[PDB]
Design a protein around this nucleic acid. Structure first.
Ligand SMILES: [Cl-]
Ligand code: NA
Ligand code: NA
Ligand code: NA
Ligand code: NA
Lengths: 460, 216
DNA sequence: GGGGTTTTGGGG
DNA sequence: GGGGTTTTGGGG
DNA sequence: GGGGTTTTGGGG
């Protein structure tokens, strides 16, 4: 197999040509009719990557690659921009002034994907190591062969990809639309934004809270199965979104089956700059707290920094599988998300009790001090997406006698029958916690079959 | 101002405990909708979302009478005008019914519809399943939250707080996590069903039967 | 090919 | 045999 | 023509 650079490929031969290229954009593989699936991509290489820079405006230049197949599984799922694709038997032609490589995977063409970063997106998600730096993480057909001579092509292209992504935006300004101008678009458009929050709306869907360089915040639904790589704090390019005219309560982008959500390789200058520049916005949340009913979700808490890398565990797993699953049994500390249905004891004044450390007994402070050290002994009854349809509510404790969760309310334990200031703050917190669409993101510690909140604090 | 007629109608039905008499009267006017599909699923749009109309045996018989030269299962890409209609809430298996969410479905019950054969409609956005809409799913979640919170506050009483000694000095203490599971209502099964809306009832035709009635 | 599926109608 | 393809009957 | 396959020379 002889590999040709993108700008050097022949437009006259019409013969099958082969190449290695860096993928910068791609639709998700999609069905067009009863027998065809298509994946369209934008590709670059050392000979084709930037438009005549003078009056060009540092806009990226690229070739396009259209892959045709009879089955969904014969097409590449591009989760990240910057990785490498090797194509065999593509025919080239000019399509409206640009170099279009076409490949019928259902006939004789094939493709193979190589990770530019140490691990592919899927390997990062599952915490797996790559077989080797010359093994494709995905490919069409039952086999893929990498010859000794290709090794240098792959290694050199990787080095170049990192140089390209670190020196240029790659996804240039002409490749997307600012969110505050989304309503002005006639049809679909692209977006480059930071994911501020990933809210599990249900068993199959995530609701992404996005904010781009223009400062505008938008929400969009993202299927869990389709885009399992979405992560809070990360920057993504969204290929094909439309402005939802029927969303009155919040700004919403509608995605289609061909739409795609793409992250960037580690070296990305654009991703680095956006992760630092774009900052969290709680303006939507603050405004919603003034309404009796908020169609916008509000995460009321934040977990300690040391836990911001801990993966979350659903209530279904915490309460129904933690005594039977090997991986769950080996852990005592977990992170989870839920909404509070009811808080016990009902009387907010009883949330703080006097605790006798010798007898391990707590008591009401209505009679005051004679009960011991003041502590919170609060019992939340919660539910989440994984347990949404069942007839259960789950107990999550805020028992601070040993220090766990002491600062949860941003109110040090005090006699609530006497301290009006503390009682009032807690009553207000109670209303926020039980309000529809209010959720808690918390770290819990398993103790004698119960889960106690720790290293978690309200941020409202 | 809600531009989608279906979204406004269905949202109000859910926001009014499934009571159709409580929904705004200025919304119970004839519905002119584009037929996106007619078989295997009859789906109509309002220019923004698609919903599945549920035809009564009377509705189709009347249709077949005033329009003998018109098969319903072939109305794809054509327009229809629903003059007499009602909405009701039904409990369904959302894993099987795609025009539903969280085991609940607001149904468009059709009693009388006229096919405006060959009327070209205005260009609109690609129609999406109303039951897959972010706000509408959220509206349904609010509806469930209200029912759940009401049931829990009625069922759970007495402040049966975990005794503090159970989580203090838990060095030699081992417990099972299912100790934290509390029943939300007096429901008969593993699924929450304590709702106050009275589940609407109305015989409706299976789209397959109307296909046989028109081409055995 | 900057696009429109469905034993897939919550990857498609 | 049957696809896609153009070889339009015949290789390995 | 060339795959994968088994048809192992020949259809459409
Ligand atoms: Cl335990
Ligand atoms: Na042949
Ligand atoms: Na042939
Ligand atoms: Na052959
Ligand atoms: Na053969």
């Amino acid at each position: 197999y002889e590999y040709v650079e993108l700008a050097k490929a022949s437009l006259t031969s019409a013969q099958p040509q082969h190449f290695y290229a860096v993928v910068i954009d791609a639709t998700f593989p999609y069905k067009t009719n009863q027998e065809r699936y298509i994946c369209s991509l934008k590709i670059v290489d050392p000979t084709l990557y930037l438009k005549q820079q003078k009056g060009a405006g540092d806009a990226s230049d690229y070739a396009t690659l259209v892959l045709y197949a009879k089955r969904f599984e014969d097409l590449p799922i591009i989760h990240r921009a910057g990785d490498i694709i090797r194509v065999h038997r593509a025919t080239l032609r000019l399509y409206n002034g640009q170099r279009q490589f076409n490949a019928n995977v259902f006939y004789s063409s094939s493709w193979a994907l190589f990770s530019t970063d140490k691990r592919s997106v899927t390997q990062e998600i599952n915490n797996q190591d790559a077989v080797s730096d010359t093994t494709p993480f995905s490919f069409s057909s039952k086999h893929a062969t990498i010859e000794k001579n290709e090794i240098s092509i792959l290694q050199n292209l990787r080095k170049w990809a990192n140089q390209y992504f670190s020196s240029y935006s790659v996804i240039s300004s002409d490749m997307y639309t600012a969110l505050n101008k989304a309503q002005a678009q006639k049809g679909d458009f692209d977006v480059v934004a930071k994911i501020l929050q990933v809210h599990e709306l249900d068993e199959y869907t995530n609701e992404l809270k996005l904010k781009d360089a223009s400062g505008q915040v938008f929400y969009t639904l993202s299927l869990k199965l389709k885009f399992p790589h979405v992560r809070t704090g990360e920057v993504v390019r969204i290929r094909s979104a439309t402005y939802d005219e029927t969303s009155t309560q919040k700004k919403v982008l509608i995605l289609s089956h061909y739409s795609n959500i793409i992250t960037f390789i580690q070296s990305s200058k654009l991703a680095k700059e956006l992760r630092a520049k774009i900052q969290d916005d709680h303006s939507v949340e603050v405004a919603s707290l003034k309404k009796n009913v908020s169609l916008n979700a509000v995460v009321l808490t934040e977990v300690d920094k040391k836990h911001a890398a801990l993966p979350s565990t659903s209530l279904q797993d915490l309460f129904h599988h933690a005594d039977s699953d090997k991986e769950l049994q080996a852990q005592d500390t977990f992170r989870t998300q839920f909404y509070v249905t009811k808080i016990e004891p009902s009387d907010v004044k009883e949330w703080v009790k006097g605790y006798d450390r010798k007898t391990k007994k707590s008591s009401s402070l209505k009679g005051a001090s004679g009960k011991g050290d003041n502590i919170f002994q609060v019992q939340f009854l919660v539910k989440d997406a994984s347990t949404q349809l069942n007839n259960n509510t789950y107990r999550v404790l805020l028992y601070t006698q040993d220090g766990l969760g002491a600062n949860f309310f941003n109110v040090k334990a005090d006699n609530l029958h006497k301290n009006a200031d503390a009682r009032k703050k807690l009553e207000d917190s109670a209303e926020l916690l039980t309000k529809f669409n209010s959720y808690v993101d918390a770290v819990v510690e398993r103790r004698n079959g119960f889960y106690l909140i720790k290293d978690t604090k309200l941020i409202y | 101002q809600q531009q989608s007629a279906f979204k406004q109608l269905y949202t109000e039905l859910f926001n009014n405990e499934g009571d159709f008499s409580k929904v705004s009267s200025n919304l119970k006017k004839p519905l002119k909708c584009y037929v996106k599909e007619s078989y295997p699923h009859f789906l109509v749009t309002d220019g923004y979302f698609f919903v599945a109309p549920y035809f009564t045996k009377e509705a189709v018989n009347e249709f077949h009478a005033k329009f003998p030269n018109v098969n319903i299962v072939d109305l794809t890409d054509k327009v229809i005008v629903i003059n007499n209609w009602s909405l009701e809430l039904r409990r369904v298996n959302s894993a099987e019914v795609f025009t539903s969410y969280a085991n609940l479905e607001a149904r468009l019950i059709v009693h009388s519809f006229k096919p405006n054969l060959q009327e070209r409609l205005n260009p609109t956005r690609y129609p999406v399943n109303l039951f897959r809409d972010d706000e509408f799913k959220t509206t349904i979640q609010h509806f469930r939250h209200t029912a759940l919170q009401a049931a829990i506050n009625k069922t759970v009483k007495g402040d049966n707080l975990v005794d503090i000694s159970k989580v203090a000095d838990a060095a030699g203490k081992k417990g099972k996590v299912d100790a934290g599971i509390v029943k939300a209502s007096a429901s008969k099964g593993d699924e929450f069903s304590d709702f106050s809306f009275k589940e609407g009832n109305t015989a409706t035709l299976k789209i397959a039967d109307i296909f046989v009635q028109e081409k055995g």
